[PDB]
Subunit: 138 residues, 6 copies
C-alpha cells in the first residue's frame, strides 16, 4: 500500500512537470524569435527529448528491474531539471545580447553557484543512501 501510493503520486508528479516545463520551454524559445545560438538549439532540443524519456517511462512502468528503470526515470527528470535552469540562462543571454549585453553576464554568472549546489546536493543525498544499503547489509 505504502509502495503503491509512492508510485501513483510520483507518476502524476513526473508527467506533470515534464509536459509543463517542456511545453513551456518550447514556447519560450519560439517567443523571442552570435555563438551562443549553437547552445540554444541544443539545450532546448535536449530538454524536450530528456523529459520525453520520463514521460515514455510513465507509460511503461504501469504494466510492469524496478530499481533499474527507477533510475532511468529519476536520472531523466534530473537531467531535464538542470537543463531547464540551463535554459533560462541561455535566454537571458539571447534576450539581452541584442539590446542590453551587460546585464546578461550576471545571468550566466549567477547560474554557476546554483548549478554547483544542485549537482552537489544530489551527491550528498546519494552518498548517505549507499551508506545505508551497506549498514543494513551488515
Amino acid at each position: 500500500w505504502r509502495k503503491l501510493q509512492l508510485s501513483r503520486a510520483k507518476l502524476k508528479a513526473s508527467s506533470w512537470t515534464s509536459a509543463l516545463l517542456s511545453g513551456f520551454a518550447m514556447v519560450a524559445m519560439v517567443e523571442v524569435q552570435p555563438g551562443m545560438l549553437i547552445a540554444f538549439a541544443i539545450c532546448t532540443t535536449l530538454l524536450v527529448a530528456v523529459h520525453m524519456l520520463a514521460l515514455m517511462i510513465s507509460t511503461c512502468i504501469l504494466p510492469n528491474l524496478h530499481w533499474y528503470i527507477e533510475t532511468a526515470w529519476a536520472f531523466s527528470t534530473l537531467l531535464g531539471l538542470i537543463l531547464f535552469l540551463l535554459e533560462i540562462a541561455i535566454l537571458c543571454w539571447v534576450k539581452f545580447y541584442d539590446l542590453s549585453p551587460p546585464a546578461a553576464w550576471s545571468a550566466t554568472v549567477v547560474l554557476i553557484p546554483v548549478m554547483i549546489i544542485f549537482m552537489a546536493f544530489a551527491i550528498h543525498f546519494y552518498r548517505s543512501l549507499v551508506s545505508h544499503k551497506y549498514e543494513v547489509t551488515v
Copy 2:
C-alpha cells in the same frame, strides 16, 4: 483494486500530457508565425491528431479486448511523444534558419541520437515482456499437467 488504481492514475496521466503537449505545440507553431516547412505542417498536424486518439481512448475505456485498446492507447501516446521531440527539432530549424542557420544543424543532428534510443528503449522493454507471457504459459501449463497426470 491494484488493477483499478493502475487505470485511474494512468487515465489522468494520459489526458494530462496529451492535452497539454498538444495544445502547447499548437500555440508554439502559430507563435513563430524553404522545404522543411512541408514537415512543420505535417509534424504538427499529426501530433494533435495522435494525442486526440489517446484522449478519445480515455473516454471509451471507462465504460468497457482490454489488451488490444491498451495497445492503441500506449502506441498513440508513444507516437505523439516522439513527435513532440520531432517538433522541437523542426522549431529550432525554422526559428533559426532565418537569422542563424549554422546552429540549426546541431538541433536536427542532436535529435538523431535521442530519437534512436527512444524507439530502441521501447523495443527492449516490449521484447522482455513477450518473453514473460510465454514463460508464464509454459510454467503454468506444466504445473497443470503435473496435476492432470496424478489425477489419472
Copy 3:
C-alpha cells in the same frame, strides 16, 4: 464503489481537457491575428461551444436517464475532440497560406488519413460492445431457463 470511481475520475478528466483544449484554441486563433477564413471562425466557435456542453454536463451530473446524458457527454467530448484536430489543420492553412501556401496542402491532406481511422476506430470498438450486450442477454436467459427446467 467501482461505479463511483469511474465517475469521479471521468469527471475530472473531462473538465481537464475541455477547459484546456478550449482555452488553448481560443488563444491560438487570436495569436496568429481567403475563403478558409469562413471555416476558421466557425470551426473555433464550435470548439468552445461543444466543450462547454461537456463542462455544463460535469456540473449537472453530480446532483442527479444516466445512459442518456452519458451519451451527450461522450458525444460532446468526441465532437470537440475531432474539432481540435480540425482546428490544427485550419491553422497550418492560415499560418502558411500567407507566406508558404505550398506546404499547407500536406497538412489538410495528411489530416484525411488520421481523421478517418479516428472515426473508424470508434466504430469498431462500439460494434464489438453492442455484440457483448446481446451475448450476455442470451446467456442470461439460458442460465435462468436451466434453473426453471430443474425446478419442475
Copy 4:
C-alpha cells in the same frame, strides 16, 4: 461518504475551469490588442467577475442553506460558461472585422444554434428534476 466525494470532486472541478477559462480569456483579449467593442469590454469583464463568484464560493463552502449556495455556485458557473462561448464569437468578430469581415458573420450566426440548445438543455434537465421532487413527495 457519497456526499463528501460529490463535493470534493466538484470543488476541484469548479476551481479548475474558472481559473483556467477566466485567465485564458483575459490573455486572449489583450492578445489581439466599431460598435461591437462595447460588448467585448463588457462580455470579458463579466466572465472574470462571474467565475470569481464560483471561486469565492469554493472558499466559503468548505467551512459551512446548502441548497441555496449550491445554486449560486451552479448558476455562476453556467453563467460564466455561456459567456466564454459568447466570448469566442466576439473574438471572431474583432479578429476578423479588420481584414476579413465576411467570415465573421458565420461565427455569430453559428453561435445562435448552439447558444439556444445550451440554455434549452439546461431547462429540460431542470424540469425533469422538479418533477421528481414532487413525485417523491407524493
Copy 5:
C-alpha cells in the same frame, strides 16, 4: 477524517488558482506591452503578492491558532480574487483607451455592480457564521449548567 479531507481538497484548490491566476495575470500585463497606468502597476503587483501569501500559507499549514491562519488564508485568497476582477477592468481600459476609449467606460462601470455584491456576499456569509458561534456557545453552556444544577 472529515476534517482531513476538507484540508487536503482545500490545499490543492488554493494552490491551484493562486499559481494559475497569478501567473496568468502577469503574462496578461506584459502581453499588451495616462493616469490609469498608476493603477495597472499597483493592481498587478498586489495580485501576485496577495496570492503568494496564500501559497506560502499552503506550505506552513501542513506542518502545524488554526482559526487564525485559516483567516489569513481565506482573506488572502478573497483579496486576490477581487483583485483579479479588478485587473480585467483595468485591462479593458488600457487595451481600449488607445483605439476605442468609448467602450472602456462600460468595463469599469460594469465592474462596480459586481465588485459590490462580491464584498457584500462575503459579509452576509461571515455574519451568519458569527451568529452560530454564539448560538452554540449559549445552548452548549446551558445544557452543561442543567447538568451542573442536578449534580448539586
Copy 6:
C-alpha cells in the same frame, strides 16, 4: 496515515506551483522582449533555479534527516515564492520604464509593504511554533515524573 497524506498532498502541491510559476515567469520575461536589467536577468535565473531545487527534492523524498530535507524543500519554495513577487515588480519596471516610467515607481514602492508583512508573517507563525515544541517538552517530563513519584 495522517503522515502519508500530509506528504502526498504536499508533494503534488509543491510540484504544481514550482513548474507553473517557473515556466510562467520564463515565458513572461521573453514576452516583453537601463540598470534594472541587471536584476531582471538575475531575478529570473534564480527563480527557475530555486524552484528546480524543490522539484528535484520532490523526486528524492519519495525513496527516502526528514526534518533536514523538509527544510531545504520549504526554504526553496519560500525563496522562489518571494522571488516571483520580486519578478512582477521588476516587470512593471521594464514594462513601463520605456513608455511610462512615472507609474513604475508605485509598483516597487507598493511592493515594500507587502514584502515586509510576508517575511514577517512567516516569523510570527514560526515563533509560536517553537514555543509549543518547548511547552510540550516541559509538560511531557512533568507527566512522567508524576508517574515516577507514585511508583515509589
